[PDB]
Amino acid sequence: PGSVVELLGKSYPQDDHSNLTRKVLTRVGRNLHNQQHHPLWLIKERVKEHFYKQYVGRFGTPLFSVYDNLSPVVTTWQNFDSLLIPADHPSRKKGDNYYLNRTHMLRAHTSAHQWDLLHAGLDAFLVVGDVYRRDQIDSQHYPIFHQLEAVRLFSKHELFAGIKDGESLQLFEQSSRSAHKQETHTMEAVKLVEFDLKQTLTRLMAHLFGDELEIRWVDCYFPFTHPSFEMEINFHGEWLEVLGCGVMEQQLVNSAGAQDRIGWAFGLGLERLAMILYDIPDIRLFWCEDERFLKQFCVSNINQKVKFQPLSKYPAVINDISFWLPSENYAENDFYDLVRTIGGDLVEKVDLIDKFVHPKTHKTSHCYRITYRHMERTLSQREVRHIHQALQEAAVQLLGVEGRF
Numbered sequence: 001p002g003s004v005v006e007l008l009g010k011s012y013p014q015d016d017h018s019n020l021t022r023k024v025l026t027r028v029g030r031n032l033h034n035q036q037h038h039p040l041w042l043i044k045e046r047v048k049e050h051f052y053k054q055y056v057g058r059f060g061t062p063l064f065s066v067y068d069n070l071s072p073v074v075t076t077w078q079n080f081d082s083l084l085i086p087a088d089h090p091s092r093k094k095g096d097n098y099y100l101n102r103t104h105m106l107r108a109h110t111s112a113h114q115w116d117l118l119h120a121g122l123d124a125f126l127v128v129g130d131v132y133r134r135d136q137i138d139s140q141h142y143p144i145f146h147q148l149e150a151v152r153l154f155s156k157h158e159l160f161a162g163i164k165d166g167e168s169l170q171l172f173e174q175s176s177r178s179a180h181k182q183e184t185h186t187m188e189a190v191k192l193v194e195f196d197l198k199q200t201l202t203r204l205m206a207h208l209f210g211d212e213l214e215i216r217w218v219d220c221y222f223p224f225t226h227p228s229f230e231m232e233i234n235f236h237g238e239w240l241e242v243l244g245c246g247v248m249e250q251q252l253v254n255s256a257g258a259q260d261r262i263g264w265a266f267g268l269g270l271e272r273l274a275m276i277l278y279d280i281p282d283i284r285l286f287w288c289e290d291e292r293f294l295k296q297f298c299v300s301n302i303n304q305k306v307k308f309q310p311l312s313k314y315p316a317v318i319n320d321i322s323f324w325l326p327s328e329n330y331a332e333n334d335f336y337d338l339v340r341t342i343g344g345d346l347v348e349k350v351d352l353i354d355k356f357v358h359p360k361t362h363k364t365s366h367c368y369r370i371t372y373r374h375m376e377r378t379l380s381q382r383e384v385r386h387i388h389q390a391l392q393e394a395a396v397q398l399l400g401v402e403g404r405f
């Protein structure tokens, strides 16, 4: 680690929270979602088209202003507080986030920009960006991914525009929160906003995958919406969630300066959708510069349905690695970072196969299985060996583990 961190021309005093690895710094600024012909970019464009064309189609729909080049550096106030996330909420753990320090971090979700954009008076906007999270390692997790956010506000008169005695209906009231609504909302209002959310997302999803796909709404919870849903798509026989969404917490919308609006919001994972839409097997492919992959996304128009042709799958080399955790100083995600650093994209997955306490010493023992498998070629036993030992050493030097091997 170190003393100061310097990012995009700015300086961050380091502290008890800071945990940014250099490997990750190097991805910042890369902006794949603004990269012409990259699948993430393509999805972004297609989503953008849907809203503009949905903005011409009907007098209802507003203009969504699009922000796809905001800096991923934000304050914990933006990323958490402004979205009502309690101080003790697990999503804040040092072990799950990349903190430049106590006050700044790499945003963990594009929702970190809602308050700012809404405070700026906006009513409908999209945000698209690289987000950052310390998580596990497998073909479906990567420390960096991309999200597309959408917020849409409604005025009273707009929401109830199409009815008889309309203006006698309201957005607000003071009842109690239930499973179906916030305390300061009318069920009349919540029902129409929720309908609008689902319909938009459904039309959109249907734009992207045609009238073929199986979706389902799932009731869930987020501190910044209520009610909230995850939308799942069935793919390869499994219900995968591809987005979060719901009716915006009114205190959020009020603290931004629009106490007269009711809104929905959603956040969708670009990679997660891309992998389903194009049958892309491993998240790592988004970052490889192999033409066998990238070329397949060069199309004349963003609607020219691409036919993703899987690359060959190469053989893996598997190596276990065990060791003793420092005396109460350790995070599983610490190790996964070290594996990202040393093994880079050579690593396909890391499983924590074994854990146990030694009676005599009270020390704890972790054993992990590392699957080395390169997306573009056969890995030689020799190269894996070297990498694996380097990992072994590094583990000891940096993580203060005792090489049990």
Ligand SMILES: N[C@@H](Cc1cccc(O)c1)C(=O)O
Residues within 6 Å of the ligand: 108, 109, 110, 111, 149, 150, 222, 225, 228, 243, 244, 245, 246, 265, 266, 267, 268
């Ligand atoms: N920010 C959440 C997804 C989400 C949920 C609800 C509303 C949003 O606008 C976005 C996440 O990253 O998981």
